[PDB]
Amino acid sequence: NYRIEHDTMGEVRVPAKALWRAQTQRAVENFPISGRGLERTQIRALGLLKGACAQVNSDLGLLAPEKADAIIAAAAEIADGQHDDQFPIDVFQTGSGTSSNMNTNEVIASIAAKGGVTLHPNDDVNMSQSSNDTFPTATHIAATEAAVAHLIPALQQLHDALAAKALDWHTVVKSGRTHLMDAVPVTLGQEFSGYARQIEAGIERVRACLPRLGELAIGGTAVGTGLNAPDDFGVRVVAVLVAQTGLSELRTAANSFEAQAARDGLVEASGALRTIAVSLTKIANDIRWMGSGPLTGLAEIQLPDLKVNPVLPEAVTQVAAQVIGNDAAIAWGGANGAFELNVYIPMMARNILESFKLLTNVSRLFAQRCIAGLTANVEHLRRLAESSPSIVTPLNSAIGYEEAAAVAKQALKERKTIRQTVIDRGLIGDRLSIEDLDRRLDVLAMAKAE
Amino acid sequence: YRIEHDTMGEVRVPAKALWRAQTQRAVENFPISGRGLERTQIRALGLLKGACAQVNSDLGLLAPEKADAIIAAAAEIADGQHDDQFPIDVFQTGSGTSSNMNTNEVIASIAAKGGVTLHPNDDVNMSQSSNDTFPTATHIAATEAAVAHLIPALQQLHDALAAKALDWHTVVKSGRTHLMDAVPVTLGQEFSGYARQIEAGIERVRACLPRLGELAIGGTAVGTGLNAPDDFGVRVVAVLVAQTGLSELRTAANSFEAQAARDGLVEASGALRTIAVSLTKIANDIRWMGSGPLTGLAEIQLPDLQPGSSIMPGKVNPVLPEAVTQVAAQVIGNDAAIAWGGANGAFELNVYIPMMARNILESFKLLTNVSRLFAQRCIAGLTANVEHLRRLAESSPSIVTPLNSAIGYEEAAAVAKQALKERKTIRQTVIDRGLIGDRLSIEDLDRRLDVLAMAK
Amino acid sequence: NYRIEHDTMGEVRVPAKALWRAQTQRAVENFPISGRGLERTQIRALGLLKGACAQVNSDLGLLAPEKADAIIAAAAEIADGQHDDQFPIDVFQTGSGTSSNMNTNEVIASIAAKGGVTLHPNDDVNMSQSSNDTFPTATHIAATEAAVAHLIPALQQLHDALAAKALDWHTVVKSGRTHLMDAVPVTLGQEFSGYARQIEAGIERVRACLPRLGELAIGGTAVGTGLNAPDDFGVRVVAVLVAQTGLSELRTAANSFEAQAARDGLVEASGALRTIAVSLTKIANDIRWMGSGPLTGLAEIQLPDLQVNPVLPEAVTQVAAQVIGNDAAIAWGGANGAFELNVYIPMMARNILESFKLLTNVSRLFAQRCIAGLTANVEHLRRLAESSPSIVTPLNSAIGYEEAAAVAKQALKERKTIRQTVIDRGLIGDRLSIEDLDRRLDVLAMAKA
Amino acid sequence: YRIEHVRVPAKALWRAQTQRAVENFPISGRGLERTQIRALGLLKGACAQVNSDLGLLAPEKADAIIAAAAEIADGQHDDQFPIDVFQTGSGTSSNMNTNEVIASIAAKGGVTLHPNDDVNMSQSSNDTFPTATHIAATEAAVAHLIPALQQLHDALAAKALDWHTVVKSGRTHLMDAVPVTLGQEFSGYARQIEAGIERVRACLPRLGELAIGGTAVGTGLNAPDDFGVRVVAVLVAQTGLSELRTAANSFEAQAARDGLVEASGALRTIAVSLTKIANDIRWMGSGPLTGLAEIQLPDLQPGSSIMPGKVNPVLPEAVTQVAAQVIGNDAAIAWGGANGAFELNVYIPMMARNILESFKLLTNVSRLFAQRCIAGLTANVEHLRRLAESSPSIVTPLNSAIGYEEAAAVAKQALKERKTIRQTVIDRGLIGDRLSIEDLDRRLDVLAMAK
């Protein structure tokens, strides 16, 4: 079953029950590429932004109250997720997001028609707007919400789990490893204090990009000049959005031309996500190597079972690879704007929103189902600390580097302890007493735990 | 929702679900992306399980009634009848063990409906490991995507560009180097260049097939083939080749390399990334040639596909070139993810397979679909502004050089300067300056300024 | 021809005139890979750091004044660039930079020997140090100096050149272009205000990474515990470095383990550089397209002649490609640390310092030799503004989008102006007077400058 | 010191146009590499030869160019190319640099040459610079990289053979797995390198395509119609590089650099394989006492300035750092490759720098890795076999004799008492009528399990 709809290019056959109209149906036929459309968070931001625009147009007396009420009601239904099946357009559509903007306009007009209100998708639902300012605004609203309300709390949860282990394992001495080779002692707590700082630095990196990620193009209309919008449209809409979302990070753009010609805020934010992926790869790799074996590996810690494969470190490192790939796609799209508009917005939006979701979800899972339940093999870790030939290092000031190197070489060759080799080489005397040797070779004291 | 009793405890599974306890545990363990295996991956897993059951039956290791049940169930999966029965996230255990168990459980639940009891591990996973099966299904899917879908889509795009190269063989225009006016070319010569880039793309995909088609099946847990028949891999591949017609599928040259690394996926992604680079150039040139109507280059007219703007009435945009360049960006990004996963294998197993499979199979799908749309909805309907193109070519200071031997460097530069000033052709400027005479006839001038001859 | 030197692995033949010793010579033979060694800025930071360590060891009474004076004098000579030919080790060496650290120790010992002072490269010149804290410290000193003293001033120069054009061309009306297609009017000044903001945002992005790029590992020694160093070594050395360089951005690391196990500060900083490269690509591309033709292109502006091919926009876009490549190498190395040490430091250092240098140098050249001298084709730009059928857009509130679309389509088909098509379609009346039509279709007023 | 033409250094063989490019592009401070300069010399000599053959260039002028160009190709004037890599995107500046240096060399021999009219006869920079880039890249692949990879392959294959029976436990997900041999693992690494050589050989049909003869836009205007085929014939005869050919399509050959992007993909895959091989080797060599200690790498230098006697896996570290650089260079190459416009891709100097560096780094590090690391590796045979014989993963073949429950009990006790599975079976008194000592040694034969 089908019905006839029309646009300025002509008549289009639209499925009888569909709430979208002619322009969405053209886009369905023009872009069957990935088979995936906008995400729930994108549809929510478009619905929120359409409702805020109707409210401001109503406040400025440009749109009749009956029409504004119809738009606001329909836009609220869309934002709440009651019509996600009415957004069938592929991500890989026209680069401005024109087709998804018209999808929102057409669906609102159809919802309002059911309520007995006639709205023109362009003249009423899109009053004072363009896709050029609306689609990147909805993208930056979704990205800012993902960063502030989801990713930062997830990272804070992971930071707190790592910090709890840094405290619990403060004196769990082990051998440090540099270049994968036996080094001087460290504590498992000190290593986890390093992982915790990497995550805290990640939170700082996300926060540092919010002044530009939260910049919205709304009000710039077609090219940034604000033509066909009231001069204070942007400031008024952003105030409505801040009041409704509670996201004080949302702001009008510093420059209305930069806000539409470029998507540099998304490139910057993806760089912060890419850095988080890089830190997470190091943390997850160290954790699966510490849990490796038991017989053929390091067997330093035991990971919670979900013979235990390190499944959450594998999920983490796979997510990090995806974030790195997504980051390359975002920068490629970001560089290729032309004149008044960057036309890679739907692709850049897919990738940045995906990177926020993956990092948010895998960070919470890693914290709760892997980090929280880790157990240390305390006796084995102490034995490893004591067996490194590099424990000879604190003797450098007493016997010199060259003699200390001869001690380590001989201890390994003769299968003797460093302490015994120092004694055997006749190094005990005025420069090093037996009591000093024993103080210097104490592995926990050698870790200099705070 | 029905309740299933496992070795650890109790677990609730949706009533209409054909998966069982192990899949439901993986659903609860990995809520990361909310996206599971794609249709092509599910099909390849179904194909592989059917071929394994066939070989276990042939070798007398599996009872014929059990083998027939697996084959019938696996054919339903390969036919795309159960794409809603694979709920596990892409971001799972790196070997793809969870998706391998999902396939075994779904097959057992399908066979149970037919009144045959199957053990997911002992029967459906007989002679197999996930470490050899999941990368095998990935390489089957990738080989099928290359041979049966991408190469024909690129061939369609090549033929559309080559048709324009022929139709516009004599459509002379000015060349552009560094974006500046250059000596004449034809639009057909430019489109012959684009057709060659796509032909080279097909050659690049064909070049990776000897290694993309290598399958790990039979190598079991670490590549040694322990707990599998010694000829399990050769027999399974022979069945797969006979059923699918994919002659590129083969047992791996080295069973350890085939599980420790996924270098064939990295190589194939390189070919897709080069195609994305070529398509970026072709699409960018096309949208620039179609720019306007009055403030751009206006060399060609693209077919109108939809209204261009919600605010600027009557505007129409190059939407298919934009979809092509956005797909290319995605392929470049997917390619970086694939290489990252490929480098980070350890010892006997590379544990980035589900992420690498997602990315390479998506790149194949996006390129296939956008190349066909680009050919059909854009290239096929392009029209050239022939008179405009020839007039610019005939007005170019770049074509004064053949006058030098008749009127001199200084007068040819004066002709070039006046033509630009009066917006006239070089030919009319020569006539206006009264240069036609004994030294230069009108016939000699038209030979010297023959722009189509200059394009060769 | 050669002399014998030794280390804990044995005797090594070293060129007779070379100031380096056994361990540098082993590294010369182990790593002939790229044929390129440390840059002048890296050798300067290593020399500065070695001198600061000797000063603090002397202040704490751990190193005799004669030996400390000899190290400080030799380290100053190295920092000033008097011995760069004595640093022959490849960039692609052991991942901690052990070989370049021993190169600095050995060269200082040889310089001091000429002055009659015997120094042991490990026991004296490397007292309280490790390559694990020294090489990333020297890298982060060089990177912070590159950002603060070179890149930010270069970007400010480019910002000021772009801003000057935004002001000079404030009312130079032209047609906006979206999707490469005719759009509504803009001014050339407005577009350049956009480019200027991209560069200002780039400066903000660099400044935002300085709290972590300026973090130094110095004092953490082998693994971050500070073993074999005084407990306040790092704080004391950083104070000396801040006093000598004037770089208040240099600080002790928040966590000594993170500072050696990872190089996330360099990954973060490279992300800022990559974003600058992305902005520069857009600016340079718009500028070469505006100068394209003349006959076959847009012919909006004239670029200054230097070799007119847009040679500086080509240099800019090539540098941006290199920064994007370098950024991928840096992130790859950054992710692959293990346990107490990330062993990709010499590769990450090469790439980040190169990205800072290329962006600094190409930004100054682009500002001075391209942007400053641009000239606008004012009459042609006005004609372009007036010819876009999208100038029908301000009539949407009077005649509606659908009728405005019919106007644009008819004006293009009949080769008529939008004004004439509105008149011809009989749209003048109560909803639109001729005086309103003329106010709405004025292209400069339409740009809302 | 300085000479005027603009001031040019006295000992410089370049002239005014090169000096202007020096002043115009102070960006990186690095110019053309030796291989690029050589390819430009080869190309200019071959062009002069063909112009002479076709009677377009006087023999005295042609002989002067050929002699000068051979000096450049022989690497006698690598200090005469001062122009930055980051120059005009066509490489016009470096093309003029070559023409001016040739004219200054010929002037010393008493022959006057016009850099443009004689040395650049029948040419454009738009066809010559990418031609010299593809010659250099083809030579780097065929004459240097493939032989270096073959050396590395042969070193890994020698270890695959020497350690054919060195049984050890496999590792999957970093966890204990069924037995393998160190020779089987090294056979996998050798295959990765052999597949790397196949990948490089697969890109040669397109890497070797040359634009020469296409002139400014690919039409061949102002060149003889057979200029390209004649120049390539001379280049192939002189160099022996049979992979060099005229391009399939003259427009694609100048509008795009897709052959460089394809070749960089092959180098990036080699970097990915080398990362896996080098990481496994440094992990197998980890220790001496807190790591895996499966193998011993040859000592190449003292490991630490502070930890005495420590020795590190420096060659694997150089290999993984080169791989990171190749990945980065590959992203820069693809970026440049996509951004051509109409008749010319203007990212050639940047793409050439990156691809030629990737070839050089991979060549040099593969030879060092083979010679200074792989060749001298030693296996800890007894340690490897003891761990394999103590693995719970080898109890599965006991199931048919003693049952799943008793085999798991054997596995649990072996781990508890740090004994082999064999000794644990004997200690639990499982040897009898059901299971003889001969049957037990057949069931627990770890080398047979590795097949």
Curated annotation (Swiss-Prot), chain A:
The keyword Cytoplasm applies. CDD domains: Fumarase_classII. One of its GO terms (biological process) is fumarate metabolic process. It catalyses: (S)-malate = fumarate + H2O. Its EC number is 4.2.1.2. Its main location: cytoplasm. Pfam families: FumaraseC_C, Lyase_1. Keywords: Acetylation, Cytoplasm, Lyase, Tricarboxylic acid cycle. Substrate binds at residues 96-98, 120-123, 130-132, 178, 307-309. One of its GO terms (molecular function) is fumarate hydratase activity. The record marks 314 as: Important for catalytic activity. Disulfide bonds: none annotated. The active site is at 179 (proton donor/acceptor). InterPro entries: Fum_hydII, Fumarase/histidase_N, Fumarase_C_C, Fumarate_lyase_CS, Fumarate_lyase_fam, Fumarate_lyase_N, L-Aspartase-like. Competitively inhibited by N-(5-(azepan-1-ylsulfonyl)-2-methoxyphenyl)- 2-(4-oxo-3,4-dihydrophthalazin-1-yl)acetamide. It is found in: Cytoplasm. Pathway: Carbohydrate metabolism; tricarboxylic acid cycle; (S)-malate from fumarate: step 1/1. GO terms for cellular component: cytosol; extracellular region; peptidoglycan-based cell wall; plasma membrane. Homotetramer. Belongs to the class-II fumarase/aspartase family. Fumarase subfamily. NCBIfam families: PRK12273.1. There are 2 substrate-binding sites: the catalytic A site, and the non-catalytic B site that may play a role in the transfer of substrate or product between the active site and the solvent. Alternatively, the B site may bind allosteric effectors. Involved in the TCA cycle. Catalyzes the stereospecific interconversion of fumarate to L-malate. This is Fumarate hydratase class II. It comes from Mycobacterium tuberculosis (strain ATCC 25618 / H37Rv).
Swiss-Prot record, chain B:
The keyword Hydrolase does not apply. It is found in: Cytoplasm. GO terms for biological process: fumarate metabolic process; tricarboxylic acid cycle. Pathway: Carbohydrate metabolism; tricarboxylic acid cycle; (S)-malate from fumarate: step 1/1. This is Fumarate hydratase class II. The record marks 322 as: Important for catalytic activity. Involved in the TCA cycle. Catalyzes the stereospecific interconversion of fumarate to L-malate. It is an enzyme of class 4 (lyase). One of its GO terms (molecular function) is fumarate hydratase activity. GO terms for cellular component: cytosol; extracellular region; peptidoglycan-based cell wall; plasma membrane. Its EC number is 4.2.1.2. Its main location: cytoplasm. Substrate binds at residues 95-97, 119-122, 129-131, 177, 310, 315-317. It comes from the Bacteria. The active site is at 178 (proton donor/acceptor), 309. The keyword 4Fe-4S does not apply. Belongs to the class-II fumarase/aspartase family. Fumarase subfamily. Pfam families: FumaraseC_C, Lyase_1. The gene is fumC. HAMAP family: FumaraseC (MF_00743). Homotetramer. Competitively inhibited by N-(5-(azepan-1-ylsulfonyl)-2-methoxyphenyl)- 2-(4-oxo-3,4-dihydrophthalazin-1-yl)acetamide. It catalyses: (S)-malate = fumarate + H2O. InterPro entries: Fum_hydII, Fumarase/histidase_N, Fumarase_C_C, Fumarate_lyase_CS, Fumarate_lyase_fam, Fumarate_lyase_N, L-Aspartase-like. Keywords: Acetylation, Cytoplasm, Lyase, Tricarboxylic acid cycle. There are 2 substrate-binding sites: the catalytic A site, and the non-catalytic B site that may play a role in the transfer of substrate or product between the active site and the solvent. Alternatively, the B site may bind allosteric effectors.
From Swiss-Prot, chain C:
The record marks 314 as: Important for catalytic activity. Pathway: Carbohydrate metabolism; tricarboxylic acid cycle; (S)-malate from fumarate: step 1/1. Substrate binds at residues 96-98, 120-123, 130-132, 178, 308-309. Its EC number is 4.2.1.2. Gene3D superfamilies: Fumarase/aspartase (C-terminal domain), Fumarase/aspartase (Central domain), Fumarase/aspartase (N-terminal domain). GO terms for molecular function: fumarate hydratase activity. GO terms for cellular component: cytosol; extracellular region; peptidoglycan-based cell wall; plasma membrane. There are 2 substrate-binding sites: the catalytic A site, and the non-catalytic B site that may play a role in the transfer of substrate or product between the active site and the solvent. Alternatively, the B site may bind allosteric effectors. Belongs to the class-II fumarase/aspartase family. Fumarase subfamily. Involved in the TCA cycle. Catalyzes the stereospecific interconversion of fumarate to L-malate. Homotetramer. This is Fumarate hydratase class II. It comes from Mycobacterium tuberculosis (strain ATCC 25618 / H37Rv). The gene is fumC.
